Design a binder for this molecule. Sequence first.
Ligand SMILES: *[C@@H]1O[C@H](CO)[C@@H](O)[C@H](O)[C@H]1NC(C)=O
Lengths: 37, 49, 49, 35, 49, 49
Amino acid sequence: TPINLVRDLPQGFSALEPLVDLPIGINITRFQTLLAL
Amino acid sequence: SALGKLQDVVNQNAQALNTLVKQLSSNFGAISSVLNDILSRLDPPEAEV
Amino acid sequence: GDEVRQIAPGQTGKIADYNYKLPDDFTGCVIAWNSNNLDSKVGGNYNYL
Amino acid sequence: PAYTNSFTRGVYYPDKVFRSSVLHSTQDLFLPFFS
Amino acid sequence: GVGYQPYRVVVLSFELLHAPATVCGPKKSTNLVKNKCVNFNFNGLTGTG
Amino acid sequence: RKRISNCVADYSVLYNSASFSTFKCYGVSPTKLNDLCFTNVYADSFVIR
Ligand SMILES: *[C@@H]1O[C@H](CO)[C@@H](O)[C@H](O)[C@H]1NC(C)=O
């Protein structure tokens, strides 16, 4: 999205296009994230 | 709001038609609600059921 | 054997497809009985094309 | 754990199907409003 | 016995979803007609219009 | 559990071949397989007696 903020998520609508349907064939119970360090 | 009675008749009829069309998307226990899908997937013996 | 049970109303099979298809309105009865002592010749009978 | 409200975020297309000028409900895994 | 011998089983799971069709059968594609009533069969949504 | 990516799935030689004891299918029919266009196929294989 082309946002321009001061802080925090904005107020307003924004959709989410489907990017890919990954064929994992696994189960998922715990997740994490990754960052730039 | 003066012509409520006339509008109500229109609203009631349009609402009834909408539900009738929306019922075409129900399964009723069938594998699919699209008649073509059943025909194009199953042989007549199992399509009739 | 099982081909005996392969013939029936609304049944898909190799017998049904090409050899002996029963209609899906079959108002009759299928009488089958083992015939090892009648037509079963030793070594395999080559009259069952 | 710091917290905040998500006003109207995390709205996606539950189905890949297109359609226009329709207000239709969709039972799907979404992010609650103001969550 | 027949009821106790190695029986290899492969179960093929499908799904009739509006998601794009990736696996399909060997059917030749025809030309695109328009402005005319025809029986359209693109991937699975066989129909007339 | 092996799945199938984009392909042209020729189910034609899966029942027209005397190499399968049972070809029971639910929600789909053998002769109609070749005309379908699936979003994906899962090929799950296990062994029973
Ligand atoms: C996923 O599978 C692993 C392997 O046994 C198991 O430990 C875990 O509890 C499973 N998670 C769920 C949600 O079933």
